[PDB]
Design a protein around this ligand. Structure first.
Ligand SMILES: CCN(CC)S(=O)(=O)c1ccc(Cl)c(C(=O)Nc2sc3c(c2C#N)CCC3)c1
Length: 454
């Protein structure tokens, strides 16, 4: 980065002091003590287990200074009322000191996100950096910002939402110079309430933006009511200022033409949505002074962004939901709290498959049991456990849940009842059920996901 514990304290409001600590120039931030390095800034967040509980391991790992809501004794700490708020303010501040251009985008999608494409085009000319993975929430954005490489010219940030107001915060924090809203009214829209609201929330991407700023939004009527009053708005879709005049789809390729470009564009993916994303990514790419060719050239090669956490279907018209990345306690603890908000499909049955999360370290087993706090007999009807370190967690669930509502299958260097997990799951999973598969991606975990789908 480019900060100092003294500077940060100043920025956050170090309720303590700092004149006491050396004031060493920092290397970078981490909330995952297991990621901290020498001269880094530790930031203890409220995860599966509280972050503070890892401050000591932080320093043993390299921490130079640590954010904290309490006295740390014998270590450089910045005392604040709340770590996440402080972490946010630090990102907000950094964005002001970097004077880097921020491009906000809302709407992951799937194959190749508008976030990755827009970034891709901007790279051809400027040193750009983008939200890595799904770090598009109130923790990921500030993380992303601060992790920005030295001399970053264009920063493309993605902003997801779970509750109406989450994007208003993100926008207020990053102050996008430009923004894009792809939208797609959710189904069982967990936590949220309905399309019009989902639209009210994404449209908040504008709040932090300056007057006259370029905001791209769908032609879809459901946004009308929430258009900004003082921003330059461009609508995209059939009929709108920007529209796909022509599209052609091969078996696994695609070519489309945009009413503002003069030559079609090729994309190594298939979809009218990928088409719109690329189009909207380009229009913006142009505004930043990038030749239509550098673009057409750029799309030449892309980079499928491996699935992403989105619902799907097992040959059974069932509502799968395999999370392949983010193999950590907090991730699963949330991935659960969510999956257990959305009531059920048709019948009303809730299944949940869980397997070992590698690399949690020596405290792996202790870490898994922690999930027992996120498992409720009332909301979850059946819970299946696959793995080894997940064993004590299964035993705990079996004692908390109804008789027979839990299942456990072993998997080690000696055994692997994957065969039996298969069956059990098939038989257990009804054509009107929802099965959440979460946990480290393993060769087998992948196979099961397969069978389900066939
Ligand atoms: C990517 C942003 N979020 C998703 C957008 S997140 O859910 O993954 C999210 C948010 C905050 C934290 Cl603190 C974490 C996290 O890494 N927690 C972790 S890793 C690890 C432990 C642990 C805890 N407790 C115990 C030993 C190994 C994750």
């Amino acid at each position: 980065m480019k900060l100092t514990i003294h500077e940060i304290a100043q920025v956050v409001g170090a309720k303590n002091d700092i004149s006491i600590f050396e004031d060493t120039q920092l290397e970078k931030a981490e909330f995952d003590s297991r990621l901290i390095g020498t001269g880094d800034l530790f930031v203890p967040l409220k995860g599966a287990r509280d972050g503070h509980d890892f401050i000591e391991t932080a320093f043993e790992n390299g921490a130079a200074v640590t954010l904290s809501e309490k006295e740390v004794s014998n270590h450089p700490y910045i005392l604040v009322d709340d770590v996440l708020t402080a972490f946010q303010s630090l990102a907000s501040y950094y964005l002001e000191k970097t004077t880097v251009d921020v491009f906000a985008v809302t709407g992951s999608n799937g194959k190749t996100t508008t976030k990755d494409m827009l970034a891709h085009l901007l790279s051809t000319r400027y040193k750009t950096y983008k939200t890595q993975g799904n770090y598009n929430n109130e923790i990921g954005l500030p993380y992303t910002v601060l992790h920005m490489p030295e001399g970053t010219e264009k920063l493309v940030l993605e902003m997801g939402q779970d509750h109406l107001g989450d994007i208003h915060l993100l926008s207020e924090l990053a102050r996008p110079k430009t923004a894009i809203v792809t939208l797609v009214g959710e189904a069982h829209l967990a936590f949220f309430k309905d399309r019009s609201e989902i639209a009210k929330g994404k449209m908040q991407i504008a709040d932090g933006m300056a007057s006259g700023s370029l905001l791209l939004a769908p032609a879809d009527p459901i946004v009308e009511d929430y258009l900004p009053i003082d921003k330059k708005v461009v609508r995209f879709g059939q009929g709108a200022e920007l529209e796909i005049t022509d599209l052609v789809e091969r078996k696994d390729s695609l070519t489309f033409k945009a009413n503002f470009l003069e030559q079609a564009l090729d994309l190594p993916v298939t979809g009218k949505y990928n088409a719109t994303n690329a189009m909207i990514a380009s229009y913006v790419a142009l505004q930043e002074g990038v030749s239509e060719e550098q673009i057409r050239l750029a799309f030449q090669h892309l980079e499928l962004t491996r699935n992403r956490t989105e619902w799907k279907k097992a040959a059974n018209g069932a509502d799968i939901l395999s999370d392949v990345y983010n193999a950590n306690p907090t991730a699963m603890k949330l991935i659960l709290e969510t999956f257990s908000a959305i009531p059920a499909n048709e019948g009303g049955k809730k299944i949940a498959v869980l397997a070992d999360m590698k690399e949690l370290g020596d405290q792996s087993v202790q870490l898994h049991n922690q999930m027992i706090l996120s498992l409720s007999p009332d909301v979850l009807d059946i819970v299946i456990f696959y793995g080894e370190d997940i064993a004590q967690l299964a035993q705990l669930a079996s004692q908390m849940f109804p008789i027979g509502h839990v299942y456990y299958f072993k998997k080690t260097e000696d055994q692997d009842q994957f065969e039996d997990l298969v069956k059990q799951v098939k038989e257990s999973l009804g054509a009107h059920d929802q099965i959440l598969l979460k946990g480290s991606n393993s060769m087998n975990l992948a196979k099961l996901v397969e069978s389900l789908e066939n």
